Design an enzyme around this catalytic site. Sequence first.
Site, short mmCIF file in Angstrom:
data_model
loop_
_atom_site.label_atom_id
_atom_site.label_comp_id
_atom_site.label_asym_id
_atom_site.label_seq_id
_atom_site.Cartn_x
_atom_site.Cartn_y
_atom_site.Cartn_z
N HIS A 46 -14.59 128.51 88.94
CA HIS A 46 -12.86 128.26 88.50
C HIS A 46 -12.78 127.28 90.15
CE1 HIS A 46 -11.30 131.38 90.04
NE2 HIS A 46 -10.62 131.27 91.41
N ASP A 97 -18.19 132.82 84.84
CA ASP A 97 -16.91 132.34 86.36
C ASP A 97 -17.76 132.04 87.36
OD1 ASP A 97 -15.11 130.94 87.51
OD2 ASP A 97 -13.98 132.70 87.81
N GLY A 196 -7.46 133.08 96.81
CA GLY A 196 -8.31 132.64 98.27
C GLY A 196 -9.82 133.86 98.29
N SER A 198 -11.66 134.65 95.53
CA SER A 198 -12.11 134.10 94.69
C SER A 198 -13.87 133.83 95.57
CB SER A 198 -11.90 132.66 93.83
OG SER A 198 -10.58 133.33 93.32
N1 LIG Z 1 -7.90 141.15 92.77
C1 LIG Z 1 -6.74 140.56 91.31
N2 LIG Z 1 -5.78 141.56 91.29
N3 LIG Z 1 -6.40 139.59 91.31
C2 LIG Z 1 -6.87 138.19 92.09
O1 LIG Z 1 -8.32 138.56 92.13
C3 LIG Z 1 -6.69 137.47 92.19
N4 LIG Z 1 -5.11 136.62 91.94
C4 LIG Z 1 -5.31 135.46 92.31
C5 LIG Z 1 -3.22 135.44 92.25
C6 LIG Z 1 -2.80 135.51 91.55
C7 LIG Z 1 -1.51 135.76 92.21
C8 LIG Z 1 0.64 135.77 91.54
C9 LIG Z 1 1.18 134.42 92.70
C10 LIG Z 1 1.11 135.03 93.72
C11 LIG Z 1 -0.63 134.94 94.76
C12 LIG Z 1 -1.44 134.95 93.64
O2 LIG Z 1 -2.53 135.34 93.77
C13 LIG Z 1 -5.63 134.35 92.59
N5 LIG Z 1 -5.19 132.99 92.49
C14 LIG Z 1 -4.06 132.69 94.27
C15 LIG Z 1 -2.67 132.00 93.20
C16 LIG Z 1 -3.68 130.53 93.13
C17 LIG Z 1 -3.97 130.24 92.26
C18 LIG Z 1 -5.07 130.85 92.33
C19 LIG Z 1 -5.58 132.12 91.64
N6 LIG Z 1 -7.19 134.41 92.46
C20 LIG Z 1 -7.75 136.40 92.02
N7 LIG Z 1 -8.57 135.73 91.98
#
Ligand SMILES: N=C(N)NC(=O)c1nc(-c2cc3ccccc3o2)c(N2CCCCCC2)nc1N
Length: 245
Positions: A46, A97, A196, A198
């Site tokens: 992704h 992914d 970030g 990911s």
């Molecule tokens: N460990 C987790 N619980 N989550 C995760 O690993 C994860 N979270 C987010 C996440 C969701 C979000 C919502 C609002 C503000 C910031 C946010 O960041 C994430 N994004 C970051 C948002 C931009 C597009 C890329 C997707 N990738 C993840 N891999």
Amino acid sequence: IIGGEFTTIENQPWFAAIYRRHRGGSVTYVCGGSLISPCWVISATHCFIDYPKKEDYIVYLGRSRLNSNTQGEMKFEVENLILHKDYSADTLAHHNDIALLKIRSKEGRCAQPSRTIQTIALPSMYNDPQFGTSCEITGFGKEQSTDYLYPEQLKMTVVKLISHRECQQPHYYGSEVTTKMLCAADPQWKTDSCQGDSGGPLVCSLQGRMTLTGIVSWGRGCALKDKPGVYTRVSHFLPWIRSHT
Ligand SMILES: N=C(N)NC(=O)c1nc(-c2cc3ccccc3o2)c(N2CCCCCC2)nc1N
């Protein structure tokens, strides 16, 4: 990384920092990755699916800071970018992914291991730690969901593996989580991966060895109650990895 602690690359010497060149000349951070052999970095599909051209990307090993050079670091072009053919995304989940980057320097070399640059072992087939096992995650991702900036210094934290059985609960993720994914979270939900992070490593001690158990993939928010981090389950992709390397 929400919470956790700042670290340096010596602690997670397999960590790869992946950037993209923009039309115009600017270079921005994309995602993390892990060095699994001198010429191969593993990450998440992704991260690249929008801009799937290999020439666009720069990979650093031995790098502890986001926008400054670390002594001993190495910089690579992407010789091959291999995305998983069965990748799919829904509103939240990313299936399959996983991605492989073959790295090559301007002068045509792969990684030279060092104090700051080392490979991470892959798990044996269908062998993961039991739930409740503490594992480490590393990355340059946001420190707070609301932040505009990424941290300048690399971070790491500890999360605990959650059972398939607990993760699939409706108030967690329902059927969004599959057997090719792993969930991990803090018991207080106070520390987590975030945007970030990911593509970066979830590393567990498995038969007395640090092992790449997961790849940071997705989640609902970050460090939210009942919303664990979800990781690509590396032990279910060994034939794909072996075949494509
Ligand atoms: N460990 C987790 N619980 N989550 C995760 O690993 C994860 N979270 C987010 C996440 C969701 C979000 C919502 C609002 C503000 C910031 C946010 O960041 C994430 N994004 C970051 C948002 C931009 C597009 C890329 C997707 N990738 C993840 N891999």
